[PDB]
Design an enzyme around this catalytic site. Structure first.
Site, mmCIF file in Angstrom:
data_model
loop_
_atom_site.group_PDB
_atom_site.id
_atom_site.type_symbol
_atom_site.label_atom_id
_atom_site.label_comp_id
_atom_site.label_asym_id
_atom_site.label_seq_id
_atom_site.Cartn_x
_atom_site.Cartn_y
_atom_site.Cartn_z
ATOM 1 N N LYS A 105 1.133 -14.225 7.850
ATOM 2 C CA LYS A 105 1.620 -12.865 8.458
ATOM 3 C C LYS A 105 0.370 -12.593 9.316
ATOM 4 O O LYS A 105 -0.794 -12.858 9.184
ATOM 5 C CB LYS A 105 1.552 -12.011 7.372
ATOM 6 C CG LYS A 105 2.551 -12.049 6.186
ATOM 7 C CD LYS A 105 2.332 -11.354 5.107
ATOM 8 C CE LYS A 105 3.277 -11.895 3.834
ATOM 9 N NZ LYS A 105 3.205 -11.065 2.571
ATOM 10 N N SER A 158 4.904 -13.772 -0.420
ATOM 11 C CA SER A 158 3.583 -13.591 -0.649
ATOM 12 C C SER A 158 2.661 -14.751 -0.396
ATOM 13 O O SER A 158 3.082 -15.708 -0.558
ATOM 14 C CB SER A 158 2.900 -13.118 -2.039
ATOM 15 O OG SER A 158 1.923 -13.216 -2.338
ATOM 16 N N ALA A 159 1.635 -14.551 0.242
ATOM 17 C CA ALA A 159 0.557 -15.416 0.433
ATOM 18 C C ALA A 159 -0.057 -15.898 -0.735
ATOM 19 O O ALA A 159 -0.805 -16.908 -0.563
ATOM 20 C CB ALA A 159 -0.667 -14.984 1.575
ATOM 21 N N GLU A 199 6.591 -4.045 2.186
ATOM 22 C CA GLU A 199 5.065 -4.402 2.333
ATOM 23 C C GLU A 199 4.256 -3.234 2.358
ATOM 24 O O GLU A 199 4.744 -2.067 2.885
ATOM 25 C CB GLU A 199 5.086 -5.295 3.558
ATOM 26 C CG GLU A 199 4.878 -6.835 3.508
ATOM 27 C CD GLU A 199 3.485 -7.319 3.295
ATOM 28 O OE1 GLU A 199 2.871 -6.377 2.788
ATOM 29 O OE2 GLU A 199 3.064 -8.337 3.283
ATOM 30 N N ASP A 200 2.988 -3.494 2.032
ATOM 31 C CA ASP A 200 1.884 -2.323 2.214
ATOM 32 C C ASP A 200 0.857 -2.629 3.494
ATOM 33 O O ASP A 200 -0.215 -1.912 3.691
ATOM 34 C CB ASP A 200 1.046 -2.206 1.070
ATOM 35 C CG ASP A 200 0.262 -3.532 0.942
ATOM 36 O OD1 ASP A 200 0.751 -4.547 1.148
ATOM 37 O OD2 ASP A 200 -0.873 -3.114 0.321
ATOM 38 N N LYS A 228 -10.675 -5.978 1.324
ATOM 39 C CA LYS A 228 -9.334 -5.727 1.714
ATOM 40 C C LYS A 228 -8.704 -6.624 2.720
ATOM 41 O O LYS A 228 -9.256 -6.150 3.896
ATOM 42 C CB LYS A 228 -8.455 -4.362 1.299
ATOM 43 C CG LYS A 228 -7.330 -4.342 1.166
ATOM 44 C CD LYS A 228 -6.715 -2.695 1.192
ATOM 45 C CE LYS A 228 -5.407 -2.581 0.803
ATOM 46 N NZ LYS A 228 -4.882 -1.542 0.287
ATOM 47 N N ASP A 242 6.513 -8.484 -1.113
ATOM 48 C CA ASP A 242 5.091 -8.879 -1.077
ATOM 49 C C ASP A 242 4.723 -8.774 -2.494
ATOM 50 O O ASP A 242 5.554 -8.046 -3.273
ATOM 51 C CB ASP A 242 4.228 -8.233 -0.149
ATOM 52 C CG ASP A 242 2.862 -9.005 0.103
ATOM 53 O OD1 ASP A 242 2.078 -8.634 0.320
ATOM 54 O OD2 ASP A 242 2.828 -10.348 -0.264
ATOM 55 N N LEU A 243 3.642 -9.331 -2.919
ATOM 56 C CA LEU A 243 3.165 -9.123 -4.346
ATOM 57 C C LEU A 243 1.888 -8.186 -4.044
ATOM 58 O O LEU A 243 2.453 -7.055 -4.711
ATOM 59 C CB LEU A 243 2.596 -10.298 -4.867
ATOM 60 C CG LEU A 243 2.179 -10.416 -6.146
ATOM 61 C CD1 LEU A 243 3.266 -10.624 -7.119
ATOM 62 C CD2 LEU A 243 1.335 -12.044 -6.468
ATOM 63 N N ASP A 244 0.936 -8.466 -3.780
ATOM 64 C CA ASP A 244 -0.334 -7.321 -3.711
ATOM 65 C C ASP A 244 0.318 -6.165 -2.917
ATOM 66 O O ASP A 244 0.626 -6.411 -1.776
ATOM 67 C CB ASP A 244 -1.465 -8.089 -3.086
ATOM 68 C CG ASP A 244 -2.727 -7.253 -3.171
ATOM 69 O OD1 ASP A 244 -3.004 -6.540 -4.081
ATOM 70 O OD2 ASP A 244 -3.412 -7.205 -2.005
ATOM 71 N N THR A 253 -3.557 -7.268 -6.985
ATOM 72 C CA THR A 253 -4.533 -8.479 -7.174
ATOM 73 C C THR A 253 -5.951 -8.279 -6.800
ATOM 74 O O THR A 253 -6.692 -8.933 -7.144
ATOM 75 C CB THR A 253 -3.778 -9.828 -6.653
ATOM 76 O OG1 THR A 253 -3.654 -9.731 -5.036
ATOM 77 C CG2 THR A 253 -2.169 -9.911 -6.885
HETATM 78 MG MG LIG Z 1 0.759 -6.555 0.582
#
Ligand SMILES: [Mg+2]
EC number: 5.4.2.6
Length: 221
Positions: free
Chosen positions: A145, A114-115, A169-170, A45, A8-10, A16
Site C-alpha cells: 500500500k 493486511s500487510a 481502511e484507516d 505509527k 485491513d487489520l490494524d 496491533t
Molecule cells: Mg490500517
C-alpha cells in the site's frame, strides 16, 4: 449489491500498534535506552521496523554495526511474537464482530487485506478465523500500500473482482490502494488524514451492514 468486504487489520479490526509498543519498550529496556513511552510510540505509527529501530537508537544517539542492527530488529520481532500471545477477542474493535456475522449470514465474502505477517495468528487469537473466506498473503504481493496489489489479491481470493467489493481502511495509503484496485473505500478516521473524496466514518461502530449497503447504493448513481 456488493459481493465482498476487504478488511485491513490494524486500525479496522484491531490495534496491533499497541503490541509493537510493548515489544519496542522491552527491547529498549534490555539495551538500556530510556524514553520509549506511549508518546514516543506515536512517532512509530506507519513506520517500518528498520526505521522504528533507528528512531529508538536515536534516543541515545547510538550507533551500531549493520549486523547488530539486524540482530536488534530480529529481537524486536521475537518480542512482538511473544507480546501478541496475549491478543484475545477483547482486542476486536467495536462493531466489527457484528459486521462479520451479518456479512456471513448474507453470503457476502470476507477477506483480509493486511500487510501483517501475523494476520492469520491474530485472527485466530481474536476468534475471528471462521468468518474469513480468505486472507491475502502479503508475502506474495509485489508492492505495498498505496499500491492496490493486496486489495486486488484479497478480492480475487474470494472469487470477486475488486469492483464488486468494499474496502475498509484507516490510512491514507490504504484508501489509495482501495481506490486504485477498483473497490469502493469507506474510511475510518478524519478527512484531514484520509482524503476529502471518500466516505468516512468516525469509528468502527459505524461500520454496519446497513450503512455499507446505503453507501454502495448511493455510490452506484
Ligand atoms: Mg490500517
Amino acid at each position: 449489491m456488493f459481493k465482498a468486504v476487504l478488511f485491513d487489520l490494524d486500525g479496522v479490526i484491531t490495534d496491533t500498534a499497541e503490541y509493537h509498543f510493548r515489544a519496542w519498550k522491552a527491547l529498549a529496556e534490555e539495551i538500556g535506552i530510556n524514553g520509549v513511552d506511549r508518546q514516543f510510540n506515536e512517532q512509530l505509527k506507519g513506520v517500518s521496523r528498520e526505521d522504528s529501530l533507528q528512531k529508538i537508537l536515536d534516543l541515545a544517539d547510538k550507533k551500531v554495526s549493520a549486523e547488530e542492527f539486524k540482530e536488534l530488529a530480529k529481537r524486536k520481532n521475537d518480542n512482538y511474537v511473544k507480546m501478541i500471545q496475549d491478543v484475545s477477542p477483547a482486542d476486536v474493535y467495536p462493531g466489527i464482530l457484528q459486521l462479520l456475522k451479518d456479512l456471513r449470514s448474507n453470503k457476502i465474502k470476507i477477506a483480509l487485506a493486511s500487510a501483517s505477517k501475523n494476520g492469520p495468528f491474530l485472527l485466530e487469537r481474536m476468534n475471528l478465523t471462521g468468518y474469513f473466506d480468505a486472507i491475502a498473503d502479503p508475502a506474495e504481493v509485489a508492492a505495498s500500500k498505496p499500491a492496490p496489489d493486496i486489495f486486488i489479491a484479497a478480492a480475487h481470493a474470494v472469487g470477486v473482482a475488486p469492483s464488486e467489493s468494499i474496502g475498509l481502511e484507516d490510512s491514507q495509503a490504504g484508501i489509495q490502494a482501495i481506490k486504485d484496485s477498483g473497490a469502493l473505500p469507506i474510511g475510518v478516521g478524519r478527512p484531514e488524514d484520509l482524503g476529502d473524496d471518500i466516505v468516512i466514518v468516525p469509528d468502527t461502530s459505524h461500520y454496519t451492514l446497513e450503512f455499507l449497503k446505503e453507501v454502495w447504493l448511493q455510490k452506484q448513481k
